[PDB]
Design an enzyme around this catalytic site. Structure first.
Site, PDB file in Angstrom:
ATOM      1  N   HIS B  60      44.114  10.232  14.297  1.00  0.00           N
ATOM      2  CA  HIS B  60      43.772  10.853  15.578  1.00  0.00           C
ATOM      3  C   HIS B  60      43.383   9.819  16.673  1.00  0.00           C
ATOM      4  O   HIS B  60      43.478  10.120  17.867  1.00  0.00           O
ATOM      5  CB  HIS B  60      42.694  11.915  15.318  1.00  0.00           C
ATOM      6  CG  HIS B  60      43.036  12.828  14.168  1.00  0.00           C
ATOM      7  ND1 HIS B  60      42.207  13.011  13.078  1.00  0.00           N
ATOM      8  CD2 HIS B  60      44.148  13.566  13.917  1.00  0.00           C
ATOM      9  CE1 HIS B  60      42.781  13.840  12.221  1.00  0.00           C
ATOM     10  NE2 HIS B  60      43.960  14.190  12.705  1.00  0.00           N
ATOM     11  N   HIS B  88      41.279   7.089  23.540  1.00  0.00           N
ATOM     12  CA  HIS B  88      42.202   8.189  23.803  1.00  0.00           C
ATOM     13  C   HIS B  88      43.213   7.688  24.831  1.00  0.00           C
ATOM     14  O   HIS B  88      42.860   6.997  25.783  1.00  0.00           O
ATOM     15  CB  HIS B  88      41.472   9.423  24.317  1.00  0.00           C
ATOM     16  CG  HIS B  88      40.408   9.922  23.384  1.00  0.00           C
ATOM     17  ND1 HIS B  88      40.656  10.862  22.402  1.00  0.00           N
ATOM     18  CD2 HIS B  88      39.104   9.579  23.258  1.00  0.00           C
ATOM     19  CE1 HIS B  88      39.545  11.087  21.723  1.00  0.00           C
ATOM     20  NE2 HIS B  88      38.590  10.317  22.218  1.00  0.00           N
ATOM     21  N   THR B 193      36.870  16.495  19.293  1.00  0.00           N
ATOM     22  CA  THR B 193      37.671  16.855  18.134  1.00  0.00           C
ATOM     23  C   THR B 193      36.816  17.785  17.269  1.00  0.00           C
ATOM     24  O   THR B 193      35.582  17.822  17.413  1.00  0.00           O
ATOM     25  CB  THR B 193      38.056  15.640  17.269  1.00  0.00           C
ATOM     26  OG1 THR B 193      36.881  15.071  16.701  1.00  0.00           O
ATOM     27  CG2 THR B 193      38.800  14.584  18.071  1.00  0.00           C
TER      28      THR B 193
HETATM   29 ZN   LIG Z   1      36.530  10.447  21.695  1.00  0.00          ZN
END
Ligand SMILES: [Zn+2]
Ligand SMILES: [Zn+2]
Lengths: 251, 251
Positions: B60, B88, B193
């Protein structure tokens, strides 16, 4: 532990020697205006007469235990449940509020102590940031009898003895607080009795609540504490801000 | 769970449909100037080369595990220890910051995740107000190669496949952050998340950090996620404020 006498409070609890303690002297000149501070919201404070509530002379104050379902929000997502309320007062012609404003001490003060909804019990919340929240308001001498306060003040004679308690009818708990929930100071501090745990969010209303001189006298003159002493002057000394900034919800 | 599609995140964690989620769209003109917000304090972030640090492709993001002794303060007595940082990002010619400013999405975003020192463990802090605190900064394209980020970006090839990990020399973690620690936005929200726990204090720096186009390409085009699939566009959509007011440390 006692007020104005041993045993030192740090001997009872190390947290009472923390840097960020309460109560404090509020200096509105030095308060930071913070428009994120919205009006407080209370749910469930208008209680019916039954079930009755326990009102106790614990030897340090008079405390009213609150039932489940009293909800308070300091904002969105900052939710609390009320546990108890209690009072701090002085003596004949001597003020006894805990918080001061520019050095001025008020005749008395009400604290409504709340637990964050993220915690199931007080001991898990102690010392955690925002674990507890207190709503505090000053009580001043006014011309008229406060009828909300009379409901509790008329019962103090039954609990004159240290460590005594009585059951009293439910009442509108919000009528013990000011009507203006939009104007207040807010800061992070501590419990003002041992264990003096930090992380407590204190909200101190700008508007005061008016009791009669008789009512204030009843409050200060009726209860007895530890030893053969009157329960009076039951306020902790002012603690330094030590770099904390007090926020204000109004310019 | 995965970014883009299903499984809807509420089906994996009903917490993800909470009222106070992250990330959010920041609208600086509607942010509330709060002068109580002081400069961030970060001590112990200048790590020596040894011991080495775990850098992990977790499917992720890429995540760097931080050692013990990185101390951070949001305010007087509101202290934190850094746990990890991760990034990210988007894909070729497509930005992937999580937070947005007035609708604008930035190329990438760094999250440095911390644990309140009132909690011994992360699992106790999850869902508790102020239990976790994240320092977030936007990554932008600039003309120069960023030296700090290069220490991580040059090691992504080694951990290209989902679930692989390497060891990197210790680095100055504060060098990954913007210039001015006095200028930031702050609000309370959630992990971005699953399990989407609330109570997370988000601090988003006003200033950005600059990486080269080659560096941003390297971030977005080196790692592989869940299946023959690139690890890209690993950001959650913005969530409604639902009455939350974003605070700013600057007028
Ligand atoms: Zn984060
Ligand atoms: Zn009190």
């Amino acid at each position: 532990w006692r007020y104005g006498g041993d045993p030192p409070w740090p001997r009872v609890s190390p947290a009472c020697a923390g840097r960020f303690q309460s109560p404090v002297d509020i200096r509105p000149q030095l308060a930071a205006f913070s428009p994120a501070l919205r009006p407080l919201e209370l749910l469930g404070f208008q209680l019916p007469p039954l079930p009755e509530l326990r009102l106790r002379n614990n030897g340090h104050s008079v405390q009213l235990t609150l039932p489940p379902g009293l909800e308070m929000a300091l904002g969105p997502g900052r939710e609390y449940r009320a546990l108890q309320l209690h009072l701090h007062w002085g003596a004949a012609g001597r003020p006894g509020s805990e918080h001061t404003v520019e050095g001025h001490r008020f005749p008395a003060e009400i604290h409504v102590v709340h637990l964050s909804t993220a915690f199931a019990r007080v001991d898990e919340a102690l010392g955690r940031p925002g674990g507890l929240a207190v709503l505090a308001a000053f009580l001043e001498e006014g011309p008229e009898e406060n009828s909300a306060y009379e409901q509790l003040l008329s019962r103090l004679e039954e609990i004159a003895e240290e460590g005594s308690e009585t059951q009293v009818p439910g009442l509108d708990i919000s009528a013990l607080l000011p009507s203006d929930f939009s104007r207040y100071f807010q800061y992070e501090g501590s419990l003002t009795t041992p264990p003096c745990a930090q992380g407590v969010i204190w909200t101190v209303f700008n508007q005061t609540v008016m009791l009669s001189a008789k009512q204030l006298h009843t409050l200060s003159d009726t209860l007895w504490g530890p030893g053969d002493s009157r329960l009076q002057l039951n306020f902790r000394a002012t603690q330094p801000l030590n770099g904390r900034v007090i926020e204000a919800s109004f310019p």
